[PDB]
Design a protein around this ligand. Structure first.
Ligand SMILES: Cc1cc(Br)ccc1[C@@H](CC(=O)O)NC(=O)c1ncnc2[nH]ccc12
Length: 167
């Protein structure tokens, strides 16, 4: 039993809710919140910008130190950093950005990172400003993630389409 409330169940292990992931995180304080990161951990916009803003830029400060030490992530890769005031940990996951020409086959590799965590709050990877088809992102999620994932979809119109078209 967990504290995630109001989700629709899509599969044994995948759940979905129309919610602002920022407000959802501040409410549940999950062990892991997933960020839709880029390889430089520059949290300028989209979900990343919103999460970082909610941490008063502390996420960005921590991220800049991470990159200075370790260099950029791989597309499809991830790192675990602090969740600040939002969660215990933030799993920064880099889905392919279609508006950068990056291989969509990398989306499966990106979702595989979720399997290292028993329960996560997450956005749809490569969706939004990353330019991929969110219906496709949801299919890859369900077919790749085996751990318990609670998906927050900010756009109500998109949420209804995802639910109504889900096979
Ligand atoms: C823009 C974008 C970029 C990538 Br990459 C991946 C998903 C998205 C969209 C897709 C959607 O509408 O769900 N989501 C969010 O921006 C989002 N999701 C949940 N809580 C949030 N709070 C503030 C923003 C926010």
């Amino acid at each position: 039993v967990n504290s995630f409330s109001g989700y629709l169940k899509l599969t044994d292990n995948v759940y979905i809710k129309n919610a602002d992931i920022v407000e959802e995180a501040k409410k549940v304080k999950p062990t892991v919140v997933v960020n839709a990161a880029n390889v430089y951990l520059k949290h300028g916009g989209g979900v990343a910008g919103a999460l970082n803003k909610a941490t008063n830029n502390a996420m960005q400060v921590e991220s800049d130190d991470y990159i200075a030490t370790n260099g950029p992530l791989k597309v499809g890769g991830s790192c675990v950093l602090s969740g600040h005031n939002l969660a215990k940990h933030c799993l920064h996951v880099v889905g392919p950005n279609v508006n950068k020409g990056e291989d969509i086959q990398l989306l499966k590799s990106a979702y595989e990172n979720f399997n290292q965590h028993e329960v996560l709050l997450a956005p749809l990877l490569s969706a939004g400003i990353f330019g991929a088809d969110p219906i496709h992102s949801l299919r890859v999620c369900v077919d790749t993630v085996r751990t318990n994932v609670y998906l927050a979809v900010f756009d109500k119109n998109l949420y209804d389409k995802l639910v109504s078209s889900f096979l």
